[PDB]
């Protein structure tokens, strides 16, 4: 009957979607987000990030994150929880701080423990560290890397695992879905976390792709299997396939095949537990405001009508 039923028929745990709190007032939107034929899983796009959950040091704020969890709960949908440690969407107090390793570590760990404990039992997975890599596979020079060094990564994982030993702990990034230095470096992150003795369960592959320039199914699959070989699971976490505007029939058809290969790569890899799209309607995509001249990235259009990419996903899921 839909993306989520099809995914689960093939052994995935879910097909899901991100959302954000302003969208939850739109009844037609909510009705489709709440359609469990299509979505068995939800990710909050913004309300579990650091700025949203710890706007001042030791002063936590969960209303907006909780409202997304309550909608998934109402629907019987799983949650992915996103994201504990990331260089973006930090509150001023983190980015402007005069830190030592000891004082930043205490603040980071306190952030993790409080947010993960708050959501204990409520998340299928956490994206514990997000976007820690440069494109060449070096570490991104965030505040956390500059002050703490590489250890911030395993320390973050270990702190999350202490707070909630059951939730799947993921490393999440973009441009780690195709073969190259960045994906190799993401494998090396998995290895490093375990060499520290810390827990990592999954690799999250954002999958912000471009129509006509999407990784092939074969390379996607090689990359997925390069992570599952390490003894972790994998998921596509933020799938969207942005097109160079204007939209045309031919671009919409290409977009379909591009989405199809992503779904099919996940099915083909035992250990790929699911796909989440970064919202589901073009109306609410983050893409146009960030990638100038691109848009129409999702399987429904801006009036909530299915595009050819819906069918491409269904075909890649073998439905």
Ligand X SMILES: O[C@@H]1[C@@H](O)[C@H](O[C@@H]2CO[C@H](O)[C@H](O)[C@H]2O)OC[C@H]1O
Q: Which residues are catalytic?
A: 131, 238
Q: For residues 191 and 140, is the Cβ–Cβ distance under 8 A? A: no
Tell me the backbone φ, ψ of residue 303, rounded to 5 degrees: -110, 20
Q: Which residue is nearest to ligand X (CB)?
A: 208
Q: For residues 48 and 308, is the Cβ–Cβ distance under 8 A? A: no
Burial of 301 (0-12, 13-18, 19+ CB in 10 A): middle
Q: Whose CA is closest to 77, among 22, 115, 131, 123?
A: 123
Q: Which of residues 126-185 bind ligand X (CB under 6 A)?
A: 174-175
Question: Closer CB to ligand NAG, residue 104 or residue 277?
Answer: 104
Nearest distance in Å: CB 231, ligand NAG: 24
Alpha helices in 164-305 (DSSP H): 181-196, 217-228, 249-268, 287-290
Interacting partner of 269 out of ligand X, ligand NAG, none (Cβ under 5 to 8 A depending on kind):
none
Interacting partner of 148 out of ligand X, ligand NAG, none (Cβ under 5 to 8 A depending on kind):
ligand NAG
Q: Which of residues 103-122 bind ligand NAG (CB under 6 A)?
A: 105
Tell me the backbone φ, ψ of residue 241, rounded to 5 degrees: -130, 90
Interacting partner of 101 out of ligand X, ligand NAG, none (Cβ under 5 to 8 A depending on kind):
ligand NAG
Q: For residues 158 and 114, is the Cβ–Cβ distance under 8 A? A: no
Burial of 28 (0-12, 13-18, 19+ CB in 10 A): exposed
Q: For residues 309 and 254, is the Cβ–Cβ distance under 8 A? A: no
Tell me how long the chain is: 319
The two three-digit tokens of residue 210, written as one number: 């471009």
Interacting partner of 307 out of ligand X, ligand NAG, none (Cβ under 5 to 8 A depending on kind):
none
Tell me the backbone φ, ψ of residue 234, rounded to 5 degrees: -140, 160
Report d(CA 116, CA 4) in Å as an integer. 27
Q: Which of residues 258-297 bind ligand NAG (CB under 6 A)?
A: none
Q: For residues 7 and 274, is the Cβ–Cβ distance under 8 A? A: yes
Interacting partner of 174 out of ligand X, ligand NAG, none (Cβ under 5 to 8 A depending on kind):
ligand X
Question: Closer CB to ligand X, residue 174 or residue 236?
Answer: 174
Question: Closer CB to ligand X, residue 46 or residue 77?
Answer: 46
Residue carrying the six token digits 């839909």: 2
Q: For residues 295 and 287, is the Cβ–Cβ distance under 8 A? A: yes
Q: Based on the shown chain and the rule CB under 6 A, indicate whether residue 208 belongs to the binding site for ligand X.
A: yes
Interface pattern 143-162 for ligand NAG (x via CB under 6 A): -----xx-x-----------
Question: Closer CB to ligand X, residue 40 or residue 44?
Answer: 44
Question: Closer CB to ligand X, residue 40 or residue 295?
Answer: 295
Question: Closer CB to ligand X, residue 122 or residue 137?
Answer: 137
Nearest distance in Å: CB 155, ligand NAG: 7
Q: Based on the shown chain and the rule CB under 6 A, indicate whether residue 46 belongs to the binding site for ligand X.
A: no
The two three-digit tokens of residue 29, written as one number: 């939107």
Interface pattern 7-46 for ligand NAG (x via CB under 6 A): ----------------------------------------
- Residues forming contacts to ligand NAG in the complex (CB under 6 A) are 101, 105, 148-149, 151
- Residues forming contacts to ligand X in the complex (CB under 6 A) are 174-175, 206, 208
């Amino acid at each position: 009957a839909g993306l989520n039923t099809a995914a689960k028929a093939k052994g995935l745990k879910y097909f899901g979607s991100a959302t954000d709190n302003p969208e939850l007032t739109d009844s037609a939107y909510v009705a489709q987000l709440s359609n469990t034929d299509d979505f068995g899983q939800i990710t909050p796009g913004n309300s579990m990030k650091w700025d949203a959950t710890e706007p001042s040091q030791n002063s936590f704020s969960f209303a907006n994150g909780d409202a997304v969890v309550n909608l998934a709960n109402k629907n019987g949908q799983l949650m992915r929880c996103h994201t504990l440690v990331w260089h973006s969407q930090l509150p001023n107090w983190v980015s402007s701080g005069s830190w030592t390793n000891a004082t930043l570590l205490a603040a980071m760990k306190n952030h993790i423990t409080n947010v993960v404990t708050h959501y204990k039992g409520k998340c299928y997975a956490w994206d514990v560290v997000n976007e820690a890599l440069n494109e060449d596979g070096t570490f991104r020079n965030s505040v956390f890397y500059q002050i703490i060094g590489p250890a911030y990564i395993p320390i973050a994982f270990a702190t999350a695992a202490a707070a909630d030993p059951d939730v799947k702990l993921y490393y999440n990034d973009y441009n780690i879905e195709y073969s190259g230095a960045k994906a190799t470096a993401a494998q090396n992150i998995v290895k490093m976390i375990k060499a520290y003795g810390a827990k990592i369960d999954g690799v999250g592959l954002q999958a912000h792709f471009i129509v006509g320039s999407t990784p092939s199914q074969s390379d996607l699959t090689t990359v997925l299997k390069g992570y599952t070989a390490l003894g972790v699971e994998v998921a596509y976490t933020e799938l969207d396939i942005r097109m160079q505007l204007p939209s045309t029939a031919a671009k919409l058809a290409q977009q379909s095949t591009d989405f199809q290969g992503v779904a099919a790569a996940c099915v083909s890899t035992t250990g790929c537990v699911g796909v989440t799209i970064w919202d589901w309607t073009d109306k609410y995509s983050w893409v146009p405001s960030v990638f100038q001249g691109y848009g129409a990235p999702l399987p429904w259009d801006e009036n909530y009508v299915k595009k050819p990419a819906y069918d491409g996903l269904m075909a890649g899921l073998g439905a």
